[PDB]
Amino acid sequence: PTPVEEAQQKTIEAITKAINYMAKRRIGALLTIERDTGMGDYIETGIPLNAKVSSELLINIFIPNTPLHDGAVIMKNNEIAAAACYLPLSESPFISKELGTRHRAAVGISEVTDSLTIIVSEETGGVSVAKNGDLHRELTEEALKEMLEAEF
Amino acid sequence: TPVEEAQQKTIEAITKAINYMAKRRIGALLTIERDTGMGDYIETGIPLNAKVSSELLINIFIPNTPLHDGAVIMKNNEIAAAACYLPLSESPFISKELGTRHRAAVGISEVTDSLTIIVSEETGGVSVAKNGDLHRELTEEALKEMLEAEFK
Ligand SMILES: CN1C(=O)c2ccccc2[C@@H]1O
Numbered sequence: 001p002t003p004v005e006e007a008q009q010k011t012i013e014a015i016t017k018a019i020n021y022m023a024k025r026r027i028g029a030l031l032t033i034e035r036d037t038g039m040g041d042y043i044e045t046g047i048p049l050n051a052k053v054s055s056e057l058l059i060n061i062f063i064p065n066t067p068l069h070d071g072a073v074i075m076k077n078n079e080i081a082a083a084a085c086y087l088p089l090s091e092s093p094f095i096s097k098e099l100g101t102r103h104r105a106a107v108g109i110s111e112v113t114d115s116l117t118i119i120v121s122e123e124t125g126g127v128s129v130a131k132n133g134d135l136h137r138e139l140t141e142e143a144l145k146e147m148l149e150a151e152f
Numbered sequence: 153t154p155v156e157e158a159q160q161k162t163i164e165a166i167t168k169a170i171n172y173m174a175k176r177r178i179g180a181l182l183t184i185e186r187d188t189g190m191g192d193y194i195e196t197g198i199p200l201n202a203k204v205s206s207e208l209l210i211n212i213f214i215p216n217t218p219l220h221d222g223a224v225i226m227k228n229n230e231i232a233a234a235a236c237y238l239p240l241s242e243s244p245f246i247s248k249e250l251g252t253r254h255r256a257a258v259g260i261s262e263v264t265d266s267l268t269i270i271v272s273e274e275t276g277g278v279s280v281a282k283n284g285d286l287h288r289e290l291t292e293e294a295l296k297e298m299l300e301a302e303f304k
């Protein structure tokens with residue numbers, strides 16, 4: 001495997017470990033992975049981190065009632081670019097009516113970029129992904145990891 | 153100058169984070185590397201290489217989270233790593249009511265020219281370790297003066 005591929009695998013491991021931990025504890029989270037459409041306009045709305053990824057940092061960011069927990073984390077490649085970022089809210093009628101702003105923001109960014117966004121519900125602990133305007137709910141750990149692997 | 157503006161922005165972020173943690177009696181340990189290299193201690197923690205912000209510093213030290221156990225080490229105006237090991241002082245001249253956070257700060261200050269800030273989880277008191285001594289019960293103005301003097 002090349003260094004790029006190994007770095008990708010480490011980043012996917014860090015993300016899945018963090019999401020799994022947050023899902024178990026019903027810690028709401030919103031994590032957007034930039035792909036080929038640049039997200040600088042949204043990154044610039046948040047608090048700049050430009051930090052190396054770790055499962056530990058991702059978890060610490062989303063702890064309830066902390067400065068960084070509200071809004072999206074946006075990742076670029078192997079870095080956490082910014083936290084507490086704004087994303088546009090989708091008006092799609094295919095978002096389950098019981099879902100709140102984190103899911104609507106995720107679908108919203110996925111309507112205007114090729115990004116992949118992961119959402120942890122604070123209500124149920126369910127994990128979903130938004131991509132290309134569609135929300136896929138109730139993912140197993142295996143499904144999320146396979147989705148991430150395919151995105152890279 | 154740009155360098156001077158950056159130093160002041162960093163001092164302001166630190167003092168804001170320390171004030172929040174003192175108020176809530178959140179234990180914290182923040183070492184600022186100076187001329188003595190601290191790579192061996194940075195390597196024991198979780199890598200961040202992150203931009204400083206008061207928000208990130210607060211999020212790191214929230215109790216019962218992955219990153220809060222150990223020291224943050226700053227280097228070149230960034231957060232190099234969190235949850236780092238520091239050596240415990242064996243000095244018999246540290247106030248006997250203080251525990252391992254303060255002994256770790258004094259310990260690193262015995263073998264480096266670094267400046268360490270400590271927030272007590274028992275009292276919210278703020279102290280600074282330098283040169284093997286611990287300066288206790290600092291006001292906001294005192295801590296700022298120490299940070300400005302360190303960098304002058
Ligand atoms: C180069 N500098 C640092 O590493 C630092 C840390 C805290 C306050 C100020 C500074 C300074 O800007």
Ligand SMILES: [Mg+2]
Pocket residue numbers: 137138
């Ligand atoms: Mg289903």
